[PDB]
Amino acid sequence: MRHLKSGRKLNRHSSHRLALYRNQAKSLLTHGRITTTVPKAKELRGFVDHLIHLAKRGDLHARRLVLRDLQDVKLVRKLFDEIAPRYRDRQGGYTRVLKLAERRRGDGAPLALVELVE
Amino acid sequence: AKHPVPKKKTSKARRDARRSHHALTPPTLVPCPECKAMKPPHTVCPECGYYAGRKVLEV
Amino acid sequence: MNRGALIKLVESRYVRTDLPEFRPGDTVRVSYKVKEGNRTRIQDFEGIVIRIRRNGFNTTFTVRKVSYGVGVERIFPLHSPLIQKIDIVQRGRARRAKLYFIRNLSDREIRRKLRADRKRIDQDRAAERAA
Amino acid sequence: MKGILGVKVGMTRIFRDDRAVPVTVILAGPCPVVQRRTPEKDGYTAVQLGFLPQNPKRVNRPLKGHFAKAGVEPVRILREIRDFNPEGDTVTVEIFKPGERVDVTGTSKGRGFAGVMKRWNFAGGPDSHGAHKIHRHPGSIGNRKTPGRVYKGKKMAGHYGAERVTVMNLEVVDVIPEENLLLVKGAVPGPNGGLVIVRETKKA
Amino acid sequence: MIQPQTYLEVADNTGARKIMCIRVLKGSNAKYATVGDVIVASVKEAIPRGAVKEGDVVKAVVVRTKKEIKRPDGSAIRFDDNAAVIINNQLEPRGTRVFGPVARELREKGFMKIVSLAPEVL
RNA sequence: CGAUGUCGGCUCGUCGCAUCCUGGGGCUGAAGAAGGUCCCAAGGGUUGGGCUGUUCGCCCAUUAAAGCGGCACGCGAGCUGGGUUCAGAACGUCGUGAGACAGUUCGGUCUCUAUCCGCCACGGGCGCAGGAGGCUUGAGGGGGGCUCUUCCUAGUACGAGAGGACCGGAAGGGACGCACCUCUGGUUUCCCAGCUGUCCCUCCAGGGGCAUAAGCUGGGUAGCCAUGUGCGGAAGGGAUAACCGCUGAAAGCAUCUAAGCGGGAAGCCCGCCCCAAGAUGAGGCCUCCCACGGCAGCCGGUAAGGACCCGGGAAGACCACCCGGUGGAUGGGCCGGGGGUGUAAGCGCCGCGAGGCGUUGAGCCGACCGGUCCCAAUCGUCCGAGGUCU
RNA sequence: GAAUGCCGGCAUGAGUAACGAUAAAGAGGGUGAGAAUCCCUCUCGCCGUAAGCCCAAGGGUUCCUACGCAAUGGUCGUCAG
RNA sequence: CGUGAGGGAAAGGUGAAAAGAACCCCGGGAGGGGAGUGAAAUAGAGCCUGAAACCGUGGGCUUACAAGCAGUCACGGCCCC
Ligand SMILES: CC[C@H]1OC(=O)[C@H](C)C(=O)[C@H](C)[C@@H](O[C@@H]2O[C@H](C)C[C@H](N(C)C)[C@H]2O)[C@](C)(OC)C[C@@H](C)C(=O)[C@H](C)[C@H]2N(CCCCn3cnc(-c4cccnc4)c3)C(=O)O[C@]12C
Ligand SMILES: [Mg+2]
Ligand SMILES: [Mg+2]
Ligand SMILES: [Mg+2]
Ligand SMILES: [Mg+2]
Ligand SMILES: [Mg+2]
Ligand SMILES: [Mg+2]
Ligand SMILES: [Mg+2]
Ligand SMILES: [Mg+2]
Ligand SMILES: [Mg+2]
Ligand SMILES: [Mg+2]
Ligand SMILES: [Mg+2]
Ligand SMILES: [Mg+2]
Ligand SMILES: [Mg+2]
Ligand SMILES: [Mg+2]
Ligand SMILES: [Mg+2]
Ligand SMILES: [Mg+2]
Ligand SMILES: [Mg+2]
Ligand SMILES: [Mg+2]
Ligand SMILES: [Mg+2]
Ligand SMILES: [Mg+2]
Ligand SMILES: [Mg+2]
Ligand SMILES: [Mg+2]
Ligand SMILES: [Mg+2]
Ligand SMILES: [Mg+2]
Ligand SMILES: [Mg+2]
Ligand SMILES: [Mg+2]
Ligand SMILES: [Mg+2]
Ligand SMILES: [Mg+2]
Ligand SMILES: [Mg+2]
Ligand SMILES: [Mg+2]
Ligand SMILES: [Mg+2]
Ligand SMILES: [Mg+2]
Ligand SMILES: [Mg+2]
Ligand SMILES: [Mg+2]
Ligand SMILES: [Mg+2]
Ligand SMILES: [Mg+2]
Ligand SMILES: [Mg+2]
Ligand SMILES: [Mg+2]
Ligand SMILES: [Mg+2]
Ligand SMILES: [Mg+2]
Ligand SMILES: [Mg+2]
Ligand SMILES: [Mg+2]
Ligand SMILES: [Mg+2]
Ligand SMILES: [Mg+2]
Ligand SMILES: [Mg+2]
Ligand SMILES: [Mg+2]
Ligand SMILES: [Mg+2]
Ligand SMILES: [Mg+2]
Ligand SMILES: [Mg+2]
Ligand SMILES: [Mg+2]
Ligand SMILES: [Mg+2]
Ligand SMILES: [Mg+2]
Ligand SMILES: [Mg+2]
Ligand SMILES: [Mg+2]
Ligand SMILES: [Mg+2]
Ligand SMILES: [Mg+2]
Ligand SMILES: [Mg+2]
Ligand SMILES: [Mg+2]
Ligand SMILES: [Mg+2]
Ligand SMILES: [Mg+2]
Ligand SMILES: [Mg+2]
Ligand SMILES: [Mg+2]
Ligand SMILES: [Mg+2]
Ligand SMILES: [Mg+2]
Ligand SMILES: [Mg+2]
Ligand SMILES: [Mg+2]
Ligand SMILES: [Mg+2]
Ligand SMILES: [Mg+2]
Ligand SMILES: [Mg+2]
Ligand SMILES: [Mg+2]
Ligand SMILES: [Mg+2]
Ligand SMILES: [Mg+2]
Ligand SMILES: [Mg+2]
Ligand SMILES: [Mg+2]
Ligand SMILES: [Mg+2]
Ligand SMILES: [Mg+2]
Ligand SMILES: [Mg+2]
Ligand SMILES: [Mg+2]
Ligand SMILES: [Mg+2]
Ligand SMILES: [Mg+2]
Ligand SMILES: [Mg+2]
Ligand SMILES: [Mg+2]
Ligand SMILES: [Mg+2]
Ligand SMILES: [Mg+2]
Ligand SMILES: [Mg+2]
Ligand SMILES: [Mg+2]
Ligand SMILES: [Mg+2]
Ligand SMILES: [Mg+2]
Ligand SMILES: [Mg+2]
Ligand SMILES: [Mg+2]
Ligand SMILES: [Mg+2]
Ligand SMILES: [Mg+2]
Ligand SMILES: [Mg+2]
Ligand SMILES: [Mg+2]
Ligand SMILES: [Mg+2]
Ligand SMILES: [Mg+2]
Ligand SMILES: [Mg+2]
Ligand SMILES: [Mg+2]
Ligand SMILES: [Mg+2]
Ligand SMILES: [Mg+2]
Ligand SMILES: [Mg+2]
Ligand SMILES: [Mg+2]
Ligand SMILES: [Mg+2]
Ligand SMILES: [Mg+2]
Ligand SMILES: [Mg+2]
Ligand SMILES: [Mg+2]
Ligand SMILES: [Mg+2]
Ligand SMILES: [Mg+2]
Ligand SMILES: [Mg+2]
Ligand SMILES: [Mg+2]
Ligand SMILES: [Mg+2]
Ligand SMILES: [Mg+2]
Ligand SMILES: [Mg+2]
Ligand SMILES: [Mg+2]
Ligand SMILES: [Mg+2]
Ligand SMILES: [Mg+2]
Ligand SMILES: [Mg+2]
Ligand SMILES: [Mg+2]
Ligand SMILES: [Mg+2]
Ligand SMILES: [Mg+2]
Ligand SMILES: [Mg+2]
Ligand SMILES: [Mg+2]
Ligand SMILES: [Mg+2]
Ligand SMILES: [Mg+2]
Ligand SMILES: [Mg+2]
Ligand SMILES: [Mg+2]
Ligand SMILES: [Mg+2]
Ligand SMILES: [Mg+2]
Ligand SMILES: [Mg+2]
Ligand SMILES: [Mg+2]
Ligand SMILES: [Mg+2]
Ligand SMILES: [Mg+2]
Ligand SMILES: [Mg+2]
Ligand SMILES: [Mg+2]
Ligand SMILES: [Mg+2]
Ligand SMILES: [Mg+2]
Ligand SMILES: [Mg+2]
Ligand SMILES: [Mg+2]
Ligand SMILES: [Mg+2]
Ligand SMILES: [Mg+2]
Ligand SMILES: [Mg+2]
Ligand SMILES: [Mg+2]
Ligand SMILES: [Mg+2]
Ligand SMILES: [Mg+2]
Ligand SMILES: [Mg+2]
Ligand SMILES: [Mg+2]
Ligand SMILES: [Mg+2]
Ligand SMILES: [Mg+2]
Ligand SMILES: [Mg+2]
Ligand SMILES: [Mg+2]
Ligand SMILES: [Mg+2]
Ligand SMILES: [Mg+2]
Ligand SMILES: [Mg+2]
Ligand SMILES: [Mg+2]
Ligand SMILES: [Mg+2]
Ligand SMILES: [Mg+2]
Ligand SMILES: [Mg+2]
Ligand SMILES: [Mg+2]
Ligand SMILES: [Mg+2]
Ligand SMILES: [Mg+2]
Ligand SMILES: [Mg+2]
Ligand SMILES: [Mg+2]
Ligand SMILES: [Mg+2]
Ligand SMILES: [Mg+2]
Ligand SMILES: [Mg+2]
Ligand SMILES: [Mg+2]
Ligand SMILES: [Mg+2]
Ligand SMILES: [Mg+2]
Ligand SMILES: [Mg+2]
Ligand SMILES: [Mg+2]
Ligand SMILES: [Mg+2]
Ligand SMILES: [Mg+2]
Ligand SMILES: [Mg+2]
Ligand SMILES: [Mg+2]
Ligand SMILES: [Mg+2]
Ligand SMILES: [Mg+2]
Ligand SMILES: [Mg+2]
Ligand SMILES: [Mg+2]
Ligand SMILES: [Mg+2]
Ligand SMILES: [Mg+2]
Ligand SMILES: [Mg+2]
Ligand SMILES: [Mg+2]
Ligand SMILES: [Mg+2]
Ligand SMILES: [Mg+2]
Ligand SMILES: [Mg+2]
Ligand SMILES: [Mg+2]
Ligand SMILES: [Mg+2]
Ligand SMILES: [Mg+2]
Ligand SMILES: [Mg+2]
Ligand SMILES: [Mg+2]
Ligand SMILES: [Mg+2]
Ligand SMILES: [Mg+2]
Ligand SMILES: [Mg+2]
Ligand SMILES: [Mg+2]
Ligand SMILES: [Mg+2]
Ligand SMILES: [Mg+2]
Ligand SMILES: [Mg+2]
Ligand SMILES: [Mg+2]
Ligand SMILES: [Mg+2]
Ligand SMILES: [Mg+2]
Ligand SMILES: [Mg+2]
Ligand SMILES: [Mg+2]
Ligand SMILES: [Mg+2]
Ligand SMILES: [Mg+2]
Ligand SMILES: [Mg+2]
Ligand SMILES: [Mg+2]
Ligand SMILES: [Mg+2]
Ligand SMILES: [Mg+2]
Ligand SMILES: [Mg+2]
Ligand SMILES: [Mg+2]
Ligand SMILES: [Mg+2]
Ligand SMILES: [Mg+2]
Ligand SMILES: [Mg+2]
Ligand SMILES: [Mg+2]
Ligand SMILES: [Mg+2]
Ligand SMILES: [Mg+2]
Ligand SMILES: [Mg+2]
Ligand SMILES: [Mg+2]
Ligand SMILES: [Mg+2]
Ligand SMILES: [Mg+2]
Ligand SMILES: [Mg+2]
Ligand SMILES: [Mg+2]
Ligand SMILES: [Mg+2]
Ligand SMILES: [Mg+2]
Ligand SMILES: [Mg+2]
Ligand SMILES: [Mg+2]
Ligand SMILES: [Mg+2]
Ligand SMILES: [Mg+2]
Ligand SMILES: [Mg+2]
Ligand SMILES: [Mg+2]
Ligand SMILES: [Mg+2]
Ligand SMILES: [Mg+2]
Ligand SMILES: [Zn+2]
């Protein structure tokens, strides 16, 4: 049973899964768009939306909170200065997942794109 | 345990009857409204990069 | 439908608002309606609040005292009709929500760990100055 | 016999005569009568009740005709109460009063594929003293050459729950008609939001 | 929530200090005794020259439990020890004094003398 | 004997009845209460522990009772491996000896993958003469079935007394079963906080990794849960067993019987709960579609509808089932509430300092209860009646 | 036609068990007919009295570079002992 | 294979003549389709003949209420000559 349990496991123990989300966040925030598997793409939305939403608040506390996950001061600086301002009037939904047509050859994996919204 | 083992060779009939559920189902495909190419529903079109009426990626 | 709101609605007939706010580590006196033989009476239970278990109407709190060489804990529904009144006897300052660790402490060690909460003793005395 | 369709909303407890009373709260009515079952037409007596209004778009034509014939707005659920013929054309929570006893039918919570210990309360095996990969196993399932087989109905692992269950003789603790609410003392099958059926009890 | 093997403190002045439950006297196979239930116990420790001595097979009513006791008013009570008072076959206390508080459940279950000896009834 | 694994235990049952208990009886050297003996009865029940490898048995504490047997002395492709019965070693004993006993003593490899039948669960197919969406009848199955104490009747009947009822009526239990999570109590692998060592970011401050597949520790929501909560065993109707009769011959009397009628068990049928029309004997009711082209058959396009795909779900191994798909609150975000943690950072002030105080119940914040189209369920596709004969 | 015969071929079990340490991965760029698996960059994790470095046995070209991917590699392969 | 003494395989055939398939086409290649050679190409080099087990594709009859050492006897239906 899994009744009313939220959150995928992705066959990673607790610290590997956390490092998966952080690493994917750095990549999404760096390039604006990444291709990954559908299940990972779905999980990445909420993780990154929260860091973007903290970047919209702008205060020092939010910057230190975000650094806990992103670590890279220059990346956080881009998130606070360039990324967050274009979402001032957008309330949630800062990321978009769309599914790709071709599966990965070596293992059949369904793939999807994740990206920041305009 | 004590190494269970098949008691009799499976007949051609019984082998192939077990396989009565093995035929693949064809991939479901819809036309892309932009370039008319066949492609799976709910995916970005791989021939022209359109989805939901706009261009999403370079093809 | 809003299931949470119907439940709160059912509970609305039974919520109390007359009782004073308290924290784990405060010392409290519970005047409690008790049935014996053949009458019913009010019995006071005074002790340290070691636990407040919140759930709206269903929150409960646990008070701990020593009675004649024996530790006793009583668990009380915060909105029980059998509670006549609760009197704050003393404000203690804890550092955590659950004070189970005092079950293993000497009387001296407890007094050392739950010192008087001057901030809330002052705030209690500032209030209590009414029209 | 009387009954009503309902939704299990949640549990709490009330205080009554200085006693805490655990209750399950049920949003029961209102239930329009949609079809009556008569001995002449159907060979038995019952009333098909409806429950919860439905977005008419989602109502196909055979269902639409069914609701039309007994001039009734479109409803999400049809269930019959056997041997019940209410005088009116709408069944509400007021068919029960505080103090009555009711039976409640729900769909129990689904355990999925359940082991022999969870489903049947088997004792399993020892966890030390040499026990070898059988800590939750069922043990023997038979004898030897006589009878050389396993009984029908032998208790084994498998799907457990998400099944019809009736709990009997529950006390009605309160009725709140302004909210179509029924307060039933104790536990009722299934999850919050689950469809339930509340009927007058069969225990004398 | 007492069972065979459980040690209990002796809340009286019989001479016993520790008893070990060997039986819950509640039907043919009750698993546990709670406050107000009677047990059969071996006396495992006693002060010299008491009414009871080590090895005696005695009866006692449970007066305090470390497993909290639920009450119909929705409250509960819990003590720091498991304690019993040694009785005779009339449910009468064999000692003359009772030490520490006792569960109010004793009253309705018929141990009026033990309840009135106790310094507090909770 | 080209192998049918052995004692005992554990696990899981199931059956017999020569019945241990509970239910119904007759006889008694049956006053009552308690027994004894036989009859009917297998529905349910039949405890925990000390000793010993033990089965058995003895003992302790209870109990309504602590039944006895069968199932390859039931059950090792289910577990154990204490006993016994390979190789080591020793004792007693026998033998000149090598060795031996069934005597004793310490030790001593129990094999991941189930093909068929069978069993528990779950799909796919076709069928149920037209095709569909609903709601149902219950043939037939299954589940369940235990019992004690106290009080009233009444200290009455009975008895010198001790003691102490029937019938009838209350209350409260034990164990067991089903469901549940309000409370009590768990867990809660990252929801919060504190802590050590080390390395790092960025020097301070503030943080991050690692110390487990949570580094450790104090807590902990939803869920899943029992130690927690609700409820169940019936009631009632019918037919019986032993047993007791009514009327009554054969047989002027007598006889429960030969004609006929009555009473009478926890047991039998039904009643309760669950499955159930593949019940091919394929049932019933409500509603929807329709007489389409070309050549009881065929080809194609549609109808009522259905499937695919997608967002999901206290549903779930998969599949199934159920909800939703912009005509939308389905998941994700965001917002509010609940809930947890327990007063963040930064700044100010006191202190040489570790720290402390204020801002501040602050900050953070999974799942729970809701709101909100910000993000995503785009766009679509494919099946699908034309109704045989008397 | 049988010798648990001999040699060879081909079936069944079955798309089943397994793919050999639970130190762990993610993304971007490149190459190419083809890329989870090759090269490059960033991030993450693991060893660090070693899972780093040197020598002796033993092995015998496995070393370096270019061109290759039928087979060998437990998948893949443009890579490679 | 075995430290070693020692053990110890499997594996023959295009055609008369290489005339061993230029060139084009799909394919990265492998492979194939044409062209062409040959009396013959299911003689195309994985090559004479090419059995059997075993695996496919197409067609006829048959099968989802049925009890089976699988056949045999009978009758009937459908298909073929
Ligand atoms: C552990 C696996 C073994 O099974 C058992 O051991 C099993 C538990 C049995 O005992 C089995 C049931 C036996 O049959 C019984 O024989 C009896 C005499 C009669 C019985 N009757 C009931 C018929 C019959 O059932 C017998 C004879 O096995 C010896 C079967 C016989 C065919 C075998 O010899 C057989 C091939 C065994 N073997 C020799 C083991 C040598 C010793 N070894 C043990 N462990 C290791 C080891 C190696 C490496 C690492 N760790 C450990 C080595 C293996 O390599 O594998 C075995 C199957
Ligand atoms: Mg489940
Ligand atoms: Mg699990
Ligand atoms: Mg969800
Ligand atoms: Mg999940
Ligand atoms: Mg997580
Ligand atoms: Mg998931
Ligand atoms: Mg995982
Ligand atoms: Mg995996
Ligand atoms: Mg992994
Ligand atoms: Mg983990
Ligand atoms: Mg870790
Ligand atoms: Mg890690
Ligand atoms: Mg979140
Ligand atoms: Mg998509
Ligand atoms: Mg796809
Ligand atoms: Mg690949
Ligand atoms: Mg085994
Ligand atoms: Mg075995
Ligand atoms: Mg096996
Ligand atoms: Mg094993
Ligand atoms: Mg095996
Ligand atoms: Mg076999
Ligand atoms: Mg074959
Ligand atoms: Mg075949
Ligand atoms: Mg088969
Ligand atoms: Mg192109
Ligand atoms: Mg609620
Ligand atoms: Mg409301
Ligand atoms: Mg008092
Ligand atoms: Mg104290
Ligand atoms: Mg009052
Ligand atoms: Mg239901
Ligand atoms: Mg199990
Ligand atoms: Mg269990
Ligand atoms: Mg169960
Ligand atoms: Mg067990
Ligand atoms: Mg266990
Ligand atoms: Mg054990
Ligand atoms: Mg073992
Ligand atoms: Mg184990
Ligand atoms: Mg087993
Ligand atoms: Mg056997
Ligand atoms: Mg048989
Ligand atoms: Mg199910
Ligand atoms: Mg009320
Ligand atoms: Mg629920
Ligand atoms: Mg004491
Ligand atoms: Mg002594
Ligand atoms: Mg033999
Ligand atoms: Mg053999
Ligand atoms: Mg044999
Ligand atoms: Mg054999
Ligand atoms: Mg024997
Ligand atoms: Mg038996
Ligand atoms: Mg008999
Ligand atoms: Mg009897
Ligand atoms: Mg009797
Ligand atoms: Mg008598
Ligand atoms: Mg007598
Ligand atoms: Mg007498
Ligand atoms: Mg008798
Ligand atoms: Mg007799
Ligand atoms: Mg008799
Ligand atoms: Mg019986
Ligand atoms: Mg039986
Ligand atoms: Mg029996
Ligand atoms: Mg012992
Ligand atoms: Mg001992
Ligand atoms: Mg024992
Ligand atoms: Mg014994
Ligand atoms: Mg022993
Ligand atoms: Mg013996
Ligand atoms: Mg003896
Ligand atoms: Mg007794
Ligand atoms: Mg008796
Ligand atoms: Mg015993
Ligand atoms: Mg036997
Ligand atoms: Mg025998
Ligand atoms: Mg024998
Ligand atoms: Mg046996
Ligand atoms: Mg036996
Ligand atoms: Mg056996
Ligand atoms: Mg074995
Ligand atoms: Mg055995
Ligand atoms: Mg066996
Ligand atoms: Mg076997
Ligand atoms: Mg077996
Ligand atoms: Mg066997
Ligand atoms: Mg054993
Ligand atoms: Mg042994
Ligand atoms: Mg031994
Ligand atoms: Mg012995
Ligand atoms: Mg032996
Ligand atoms: Mg041997
Ligand atoms: Mg030996
Ligand atoms: Mg010796
Ligand atoms: Mg000697
Ligand atoms: Mg001899
Ligand atoms: Mg001898
Ligand atoms: Mg001699
Ligand atoms: Mg000698
Ligand atoms: Mg011999
Ligand atoms: Mg011997
Ligand atoms: Mg010896
Ligand atoms: Mg040893
Ligand atoms: Mg031995
Ligand atoms: Mg031995
Ligand atoms: Mg083993
Ligand atoms: Mg063996
Ligand atoms: Mg084996
Ligand atoms: Mg396998
Ligand atoms: Mg099988
Ligand atoms: Mg078979
Ligand atoms: Mg199907
Ligand atoms: Mg089906
Ligand atoms: Mg039936
Ligand atoms: Mg049948
Ligand atoms: Mg039945
Ligand atoms: Mg009386
Ligand atoms: Mg008299
Ligand atoms: Mg009575
Ligand atoms: Mg009862
Ligand atoms: Mg809750
Ligand atoms: Mg809880
Ligand atoms: Mg709670
Ligand atoms: Mg709790
Ligand atoms: Mg805890
Ligand atoms: Mg966290
Ligand atoms: Mg650190
Ligand atoms: Mg640096
Ligand atoms: Mg620092
Ligand atoms: Mg590191
Ligand atoms: Mg490390
Ligand atoms: Mg680690
Ligand atoms: Mg940590
Ligand atoms: Mg620590
Ligand atoms: Mg913890
Ligand atoms: Mg929780
Ligand atoms: Mg329980
Ligand atoms: Mg009960
Ligand atoms: Mg007469
Ligand atoms: Mg005569
Ligand atoms: Mg007659
Ligand atoms: Mg009669
Ligand atoms: Mg009669
Ligand atoms: Mg009579
Ligand atoms: Mg009768
Ligand atoms: Mg009964
Ligand atoms: Mg049904
Ligand atoms: Mg049907
Ligand atoms: Mg049906
Ligand atoms: Mg039949
Ligand atoms: Mg039908
Ligand atoms: Mg019908
Ligand atoms: Mg349509
Ligand atoms: Mg449906
Ligand atoms: Mg749908
Ligand atoms: Mg659509
Ligand atoms: Mg739309
Ligand atoms: Mg939504
Ligand atoms: Mg939402
Ligand atoms: Mg929220
Ligand atoms: Mg809040
Ligand atoms: Mg709060
Ligand atoms: Mg502060
Ligand atoms: Mg601060
Ligand atoms: Mg200063
Ligand atoms: Mg200060
Ligand atoms: Mg919040
Ligand atoms: Mg939108
Ligand atoms: Mg709206
Ligand atoms: Mg389309
Ligand atoms: Mg021959
Ligand atoms: Mg053979
Ligand atoms: Mg062979
Ligand atoms: Mg053989
Ligand atoms: Mg051979
Ligand atoms: Mg041969
Ligand atoms: Mg051979
Ligand atoms: Mg061969
Ligand atoms: Mg094969
Ligand atoms: Mg083979
Ligand atoms: Mg498969
Ligand atoms: Mg298999
Ligand atoms: Mg498998
Ligand atoms: Mg596998
Ligand atoms: Mg492995
Ligand atoms: Mg591996
Ligand atoms: Mg690339
Ligand atoms: Mg790449
Ligand atoms: Mg690759
Ligand atoms: Mg590749
Ligand atoms: Mg590289
Ligand atoms: Mg070092
Ligand atoms: Mg070499
Ligand atoms: Mg070199
Ligand atoms: Mg080289
Ligand atoms: Mg190299
Ligand atoms: Mg190269
Ligand atoms: Mg290669
Ligand atoms: Mg290759
Ligand atoms: Mg290749
Ligand atoms: Mg290879
Ligand atoms: Mg390869
Ligand atoms: Mg390999
Ligand atoms: Mg290349
Ligand atoms: Mg290589
Ligand atoms: Mg050799
Ligand atoms: Mg060699
Ligand atoms: Mg040789
Ligand atoms: Mg040769
Ligand atoms: Mg030639
Ligand atoms: Mg030649
Ligand atoms: Mg020639
Ligand atoms: Mg090419
Ligand atoms: Mg080309
Ligand atoms: Mg070529
Ligand atoms: Mg070709
Ligand atoms: Mg060619
Ligand atoms: Mg030619
Ligand atoms: Mg010729
Ligand atoms: Mg030829
Ligand atoms: Mg030829
Ligand atoms: Mg020739
Ligand atoms: Mg040839
Ligand atoms: Mg050939
Ligand atoms: Mg051939
Ligand atoms: Mg064919
Ligand atoms: Mg039939
Ligand atoms: Mg047929
Ligand atoms: Mg025949
Ligand atoms: Mg004939
Ligand atoms: Zn397109």
| Chain A residues in contact with B43 (beta carbon < 8 A) | 99-101
Phi then psi for D94, rounded to 5 degrees? -75, -5
Closest-CA residue in chain D for A2?
Answer: D111
The set of long-range contacts for B3-11, using a CB threshold of 8 Å and a minimum separation of 24, is none
- CA distances, A50 to each of A54, A72, D194, E116 (Å): 6, 17, 33, 64
Within 10 Å of residue C128's Cβ, how many Cβ atoms? Answer: 7
Q: Strand G closer than 7 Å to the CB of A19?
A: yes
Angle (CA) C44-C45-C50 rounded to 5° is 155
Instruction: Give the A:B interface size as CB pairs under 8 Å.
Output: 19
Contact of E19 with E10, CB cutoff 8 Å: yes
Angle between the N-to-C axes of helices A14-31 and A60-70, in degrees from 0 to 180, rounded to the nearest 10: 110
Within 10 Å of residue E56's Cβ, how many Cβ atoms? Answer: 18
Q: Which residues contact D60 (CB under 8 A, 6 or more apart)?
A: none
Distance in Å, residue D107 CA to nucleotide F124 C1': 26
Method of determination used here: X-ray
Instruction: Using CB atoms within 10 Å of the CB of residue D137, give its burial: 0 to 12 exposed, 13 to 18 middle, 19+ buried.
Output: middle
- CA distances, D76 to each of B4, D52, D177 (Å): 53, 5, 21
Closest-CA residue in chain B for A34?
Answer: B57
List the CATH code of the domain at A14-118. 3.90.1030.10
CA gap C77, C62 in Å, rounded: 9
**Amino acid residing at B16:** D
CA gap C57, D88 in Å, rounded: 38
Quick one: CA torsion of E45, E48, E53, E54, rounded to 10 degrees? 40
E66 vs C: CB within 8 A: no
Q: Min CA distance, D33 vs chain A (Å)?
A: 35
Chain E neighbors (3+ CB pairs < 8 Å): C, D
Distance B45 CA to ligand 142 centre (A): 104
Phi then psi for E18, rounded to 5 degrees? -140, 130
CA gap A28, E99 in Å, rounded: 70
Closest-CA residue in chain E for D18?
Answer: E73
Of B46, B56, B57, Cβ closest to residue A102: B46
Contact of C25 with C94, CB cutoff 8 Å: yes
Two tokens, residue A49: 């939306």
Helix (H/G/I), strand (E/B), else coil: D162? coil
CA gap E61, A91 in Å, rounded: 66
Phi then psi for D51, rounded to 5 degrees? -160, 135
CA gap E63, E15 in Å, rounded: 17
CA gap C129, C43 in Å, rounded: 29
CA gap E32, E9 in Å, rounded: 17
Resolution in A: 2.3
Only one residue has tokens 């019809």, namely D164
Contact of A19 with A26, CB cutoff 8 Å: no
CA gap A66, A29 in Å, rounded: 12
| Binding-site residues on chain A for chain B (CB distance < 8 A) | 98-102, 113
User: Which is nearest to E71 in space by CA: D99, C22, C59, C82?
Assistant: C82
Report chain F positions within 7 A of protein CB atoms: 10-14, 47-49, 60-66, 71-72, 74-81, 110-124, 132-138, 142-143, 148, 173-185, 189-190, 201-202, 206-211, 213-215, 218-220, 222-225, 227-236, 272-275, 284-289, 304-306, 308-317, 324-325, 327-329, 332-335, 337-346, 357-359, 361, 363-372, 374-381
Distance in Å, residue D144 CA to nucleotide F311 C1': 53
Distance in Å, residue C97 CA to nucleotide F72 C1': 65
Two tokens, residue D98: 């505080």
Contact of E21 with E4, CB cutoff 8 Å: yes
CA gap A38, A29 in Å, rounded: 18
Residue B59: which H helix or E strand, with range?
none
Concatenate the DSSP letters of all residues of A43-92 into one string. Answer: HHHHHHHHHHHHHHH-SHHHHHHHHHHH--HHHHHHIIIIIGGGGTT--S
Of E64, E75, E122, Cβ closest to residue C75: E75
Strand ranges inside E2-75, DSSP E: 7-10, 16-24, 38-46, 57-64, 69-70
Distance C49 CA to ligand 64 centre (A): 72
Q: Is A108 left (phi over 0), alpha (psi -120 to 50) or beta?
A: left
Q: Strand G closer than 7 Å to the CB of A78?
A: no
Contact of D102 with D170, CB cutoff 8 Å: yes
* For testing contact with chain E, the best of C64, C70, C73 (most E CBs within 10 A): C70
Contact of C46 with C64, CB cutoff 8 Å: no
